[model samples]
Target: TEEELLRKLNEQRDILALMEVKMKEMKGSIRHLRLTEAKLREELREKDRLLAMAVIRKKHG
Candidate 1:
């Protein structure tokens, strides 16, 4: 029975969708961070292997 409320709800829905996409991107960054952590752990295990590993790994930011 309220048109204004419906319009506001629609706007909020669009905003929520954009937020979800941003969240997915953030999650991906977190995963990349985990990979970096593993790579660092490997580097600590073998300093020589670091040079080879560096090329495959990357900066998280």
Candidate 2:
């Protein structure tokens, strides 16, 4: 009985270790997505500025 309990404890420890590794990977991906979001926002703003300038030119000319 003692040997069986020891084996069960080791198995549980392995599962926890695997979960920790997976969580770290997920955290890395989330960080990457945040960076990509910021980059896209910057590009969108630049495009909007150009469009506004074009509209103003058309209105005046």
Candidate 3:
């Protein structure tokens, strides 16, 4: 039927709009989390370097 098909088409049109917004949000979320993980990794490396220097100083003194 034309009316049923038209109604289903309209419903699906709304779904496409929602899918677009959700897709953008999901992509941004992944990149945001990745940035946070990178920052933590950098901090850990710095801390390890500092600790190694401290150990060397203690051993020498």
Candidate 4:
């Protein structure tokens, strides 16, 4: 019974390690997505600025 208990403990430890790795990977992806989202927002802001400039020029010219 001691041997069986030890083996089960080891198995649970291995499972916890696996879950930790998966969690790290998920965090990495979430960070990457956030970075991408910020970049997209910046691009959209630039586009809006240019469009506004174009509209102002058309009205003045």
Pick the TM-score winner. Answer: 2
Better of 1 and 2 by TM-score: 2
Q: Report the number of the highest-lDDT candidate.
A: 4
Runs off by more than 4 Å, candidate 3: none
Q: Alpha-carbon error at 61 in model 1, in Å?
A: 44
Q: List the candidates' TM-scores in order.
A: 0.69, 0.86, 0.84, 0.81
By lDDT, the candidates rank as: 4, 2, 3, 1
lDDT of candidate 1 over 1-61, digit per residue (tens)? 6999999999999999999999999999999999999999887779767755786576532
Q: How would you encode candidate 4's per-residue C-alpha lDDT over 1-61 as one tens digit per residue?
A: 6999999999999999999999999999999999999999999999999999999999998
lDDT of each: 0.89, 0.98, 0.97, 0.99
2 or 4, greater by lDDT: 4
Count steric clashes of candidate 2: 0
Candidate 2: minimum summed lDDT over ten consecutive residues — where?
1-10
For residues 1-61, write the lDDT of model 2, one tens digit per residue: 6999999999999999999999999999999999999999999999999999999999997
All models, RMSD in angstroms: 11.4, 1.4, 1.4, 1.5
RMSD of 4: 1.5
Which stretch of 10 consecutive residues in model 1 shows the poorest summed lDDT?
A: 52-61
Per-residue lDDT over 1-61 for candidate 3, one digit per residue giving the tens place of the 0 to 100 score: 6999999998999999999999999999999999999999999999999999999999997
Which of 2 and 3 is the better model by TM-score?
A: 2
* Candidate 1 global lDDT: 0.89
